Design a protein around this ligand. Structure first.
Ligand SMILES: *C/C=C1/C(=C/c2[nH]c(/C=C3[NH+]=C(/C=C4\NC(=O)C(C=C)=C4C)C(C)=C\3CCC(=O)O)c(CCC(=O)O)c2C)NC(=O)[C@H]1C
Length: 308
């Protein structure tokens, strides 16, 4: 069972209990965006990331108790209709907000709570990218095409296809990398490097990232959902703070930015499209949506090719 989180008297995580870190409820976000939670009926703002002023122009204690009807009059009705009570928690409402300078708005529902993510935002290629994946004559060719295509889309210094063995050990079976980088191709890693609860989370929530592996997490306050007096589920929030233990591994690797997309075959975590940048790097929200779609196409092509 999960340890309590740090804000409920839980211990700091060590290599003795990697698998017990409740990574889905860090009660904090990454600083390149802002997060609000709001009542799924009233639209009352219940929780604020402490950096909410940077992106929304109001401090946490001023946003708290205001309604989305007031804060987002243009979107609040469509938001309500798009994410009704009982809808699946993977279902997203997406808008582009005009701000005095665009801001990408991503919302999902967890029970009676709306989770709002704000971050700055900036087809003939993508179609040939899809046909290129379809046209790979074997799994290795597919792996190479997938990593090259994602590297061209994103500009990431390294894109790997990280495949799980039945014992949950991991191997780099293909990679596209910048001139001068060490090869990881064929290198194998222990199961503990991506522990059991991360693997579980990655079967349901198919994309996660650390834009800056040195950035302190920004607290969500109040940290507990006032509805439940319990932690706010952030497994579906891309602005979710990353495991400190994971962040440290990346820093030691010389990685300033990390992003991965789940490859899911027959409802099991087959592997990851695993991306690194040496410098901190925010992949624009448009390019993430594209990478999500490519992971789903790649997941289907892997299932086929691997039967052969
Ligand atoms: C005692 C805890 C440990 C730990 C925890 C941990 N690791 C992750 C997530 C990831 N680890 C990855 C590992 C690798 N990336 C690479 O590039 C290579 C080798 C070339 C390896 C072995 C990957 C890809 C992930 C996924 C996230 C990402 O893409 O960066 C988590 C979950 C993090 C989160 O989602 O919040 C956790 C808790 N890792 C350890 O090594 C030990 C110390």
């Amino acid at each position: 069972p999960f340890f309590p989180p740090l804000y409920l008297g839980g211990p700091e995580i060590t290599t003795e209990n990697c698998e017990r870190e409740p990574i889905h409820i860090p009660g904090s976000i990454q600083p390149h965006g802002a997060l609000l939670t709001a009542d799924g009926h009233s639209g009352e703002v219940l929780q604020m990331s402490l950096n909410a002023a940077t992106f929304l122009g109001q401090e946490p204690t001023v946003l708290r108790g205001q309604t989305l009807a007031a804060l987002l009059p243009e979107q609040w009705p469509a938001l309500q209709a798009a994410l009704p009570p009982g809808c699946p928690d993977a279902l997203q409402y997406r808008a582009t907000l005009d701000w005095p300078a665009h801001l990408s708005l991503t919302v999902h529902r967890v029970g009676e709570l709306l989770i709002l993510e704000f971050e700055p935002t900036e087809p003939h290629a993508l179609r040939n990218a899809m046909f290129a994946l379809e046209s790979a004559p074997n799994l290795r060719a597919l792996a190479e095409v997938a990593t090259q295509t994602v590297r061209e889309l994103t500009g990431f210094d390294r894109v790997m296809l990280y495949k799980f063995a039945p014992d949950a050990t991991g191997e780099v079976i293909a990679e596209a990398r910048r001139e001068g980088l060490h090869a990881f191709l064929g290198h194998r890693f222990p199961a503990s490097d991506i522990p059991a609860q991360a693997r579980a989370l990655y079967t349901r929530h198919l994309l996660r990232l650390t834009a800056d592996t040195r950035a302190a997490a920004v607290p969500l306050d109040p940290v507990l959902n006032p509805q439940t007096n319990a932690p706010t589920p952030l497994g579906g929030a891309v602005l979710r703070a990353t495991s400190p233990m994971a962040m440290q591994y990346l820093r030691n690797m010389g990685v300033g930015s990390s992003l991965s997309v789940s490859v899911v075959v027959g409802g099991q975590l087959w592997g990851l499209i695993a991306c690194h940048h040496q410098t901190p790097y925010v992949l624009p929200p448009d390019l993430r949506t594209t990478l999500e779609y490519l992971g789903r196409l790649l997941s289907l092509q892997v299932q086929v090719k691997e039967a052969l």
